[PDB]
Every structure is written in structure tokens, then in C-alpha cells.
Amino acid sequence: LYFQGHMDRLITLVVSYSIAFSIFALATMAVVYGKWLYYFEIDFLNIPDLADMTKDEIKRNYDVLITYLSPFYDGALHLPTLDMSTNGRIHFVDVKNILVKIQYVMYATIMIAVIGGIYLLKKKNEKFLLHGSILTIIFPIALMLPIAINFEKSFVLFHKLLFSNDYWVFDPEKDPIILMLPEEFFMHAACAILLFILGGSILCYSLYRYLVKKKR
Ligand SMILES: CCCCCCCC/C=C\CCCCCCCC(=O)OC[C@H](O)CO
Numbered sequence: 001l002y003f004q005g006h007m008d009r010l011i012t013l014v015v016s017y018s019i020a021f022s023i024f025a026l027a028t029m030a031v032v033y034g035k036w037l038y039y040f041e042i043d044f045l046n047i048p049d050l051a052d053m054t055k056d057e058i059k060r061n062y063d064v065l066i067t068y069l070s071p072f073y074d075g076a077l078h079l080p081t082l083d084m085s086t087n088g089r090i091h092f093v094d095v096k097n098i099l100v101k102i103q104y105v106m107y108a109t110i111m112i113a114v115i116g117g118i119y120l121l122k123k124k125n126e127k128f129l130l131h132g133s134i135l136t137i138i139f140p141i142a143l144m145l146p147i148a149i150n151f152e153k154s155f156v157l158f159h160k161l162l163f164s165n166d167y168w169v170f171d172p173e174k175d176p177i178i179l180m181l182p183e184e185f186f187m188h189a190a191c192a193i194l195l196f197i198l199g200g201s202i203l204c205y206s207l208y209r210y211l212v213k214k215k216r
Pocket residue numbers: 019022023024026027030113114117118121196197200203204207
């Protein structure tokens with residue numbers, strides 16, 4: 001009992017951070033691989049005007065690129081309409097590699113938390129559900145203002161942090177897909193992620209309080 005205390009409490013520690021990360025990764029893949037937001041973006045930002053492309057050309061290029069970024073696509077990236085340089089296809093491999101590593105870690109934290117969670121959950125201990133929501137709502141709270149007021153510079157730091165080359169700044173001449181990827185769209189995608197993080201936090205917290213009311 002002196003040791004089930006710690007071990008259950010280390011599992012509530014390990015499980016808690018894996019709840020936070022799993023929500024982070026899940027919200028990312030939902031926004032990254034979701035095409036509903038970007039399809040709305042095409043008319044809302046008037047991307048045809050921005051890129052001198054048609055609504056059909058923009059959709060298929062985005063369709064092909066999003067398909068290229070899945071773990072289960074082993075082919076190279078060829079855009080239906082736009083040409084691209086070797087620097088351009090190095091960046092999308094960088095982006096593809098980042099997504100794959102987040103997803104690999106995400107499966108671990110999703111399993112760690114579901115398996116280890118139900119262990120502590122059926123053992124009448126829900127401390128991990130409060131800690132999880134607190135840890136994961138730190139994300140939107142810390143980053144809501146950086147995106148809202150300083151997106152352009154937060155965007156650069158983000159890229160500088162995650163990429164070890166210069167190729168993330170696209171030359172419209174050699175990589176014209178940058179014209180159909182406006183900065184406002186990535187800003188909305190960052191907001192959608194944070195809303196899903198915040199949504200998952202509230203969801204995770206709704207359970208905690210609801211479960212604590214069960215014990216009493
Ligand atoms: C079995 C009786 C109750 C069932 C509970 C099973 C126990 C699962 C344990 C830990 C994970 C719980 C996570 C709390 C809920 C979070 C919901 C979620 O993970 O979704 C995040 C969303 O996908 C982000 O975009």
C-alpha cells in the first residue's frame with residue numbers, strides 16, 4: 001500500500017503528460033489532414049486571385065499535397081499544376097518527417113494513457129484526469145496571444161525551431177504553391193488546433209468532475 005501509492009501515482013504522472021500530448025497530436029492531425037478548413041479558405045481569402053489559379057487547380061494541388069503528407073504514401077510529391085524546385089521538395093519531406101514522428105509518439109501516448117488510464121480509473125483514482133486537462137490547457141493559454149498578435153514573427157520562430165535549413169521560405173518563382181498558401185490560412189489552422197486543444201481539455205475536465213461526483 002506504501003508502494004501502490006507511488007506506482008499508481010507515477011502512472012498518474014506518466015499518464016497525465018501522455019493525455020496532454022495525445023490531444024496536441026490529435027488536434028494537429030485533424031487540422032493538418034482535414035481539408036474542410038482550407039476549402040473554406042479558398043473563397044474566404046479569394047485564393048484564386050492570390051495565386052492566379054482556378055478553384056479546381058488549387059483544390060487538386062492541395063489534395064495531392066495533403067495525400068503526400070500521410071505516413072502511408074510512399075511516393076514522391078508531384079503537384080498537378082505547379083512546378084517546384086529541389087529545395088521545395090526538401091521542405092515537404094521535412095514537414096512529412098515531422099508529422100510521422102509526432103504520430104509515432106502519439107500512438108505510444110495514446111496507448112500509455114488508455115491502458116494505464118483505465119487501470120487507475122477502475123482503481124477509483126481520477127487524479128490523472130484533472131492533471132491532464134490542466135497540462136493540456138496550458139497550450140492554448142500560452143499560445144493564444146502569440147498567434148493573435150504576433151503570428152508573422154511567431155511563424156518564423158516556429159519554422160526556425162522545427163527546421164534545420166532555409167527551404168521553408170518559398171520563392172514564388174520556383175515554388176508557386178506558396179501563392180495558394182497564404183499566411184492567414186496557417187493562422188486559422190493554428191487557431192483551429194488551439195480550439196481542439198482547448199476542446200479536448202474541457203472534455204477531459206468534464207469527465208474528471210463528473211467522475212469525482214460519482215465517488216460522492
Ligand atoms: C472506462 C470508463 C470511462 C471511460 C474513460 C476511458 C479511460 C481513458 C483514460 C484516459 C484517456 C481519457 C482522456 C480524457 C478524454 C479526452 C478526450 C480525447 O482524448 O479527445 C481529444 C481530442 O481528440 C483532441 O483533439
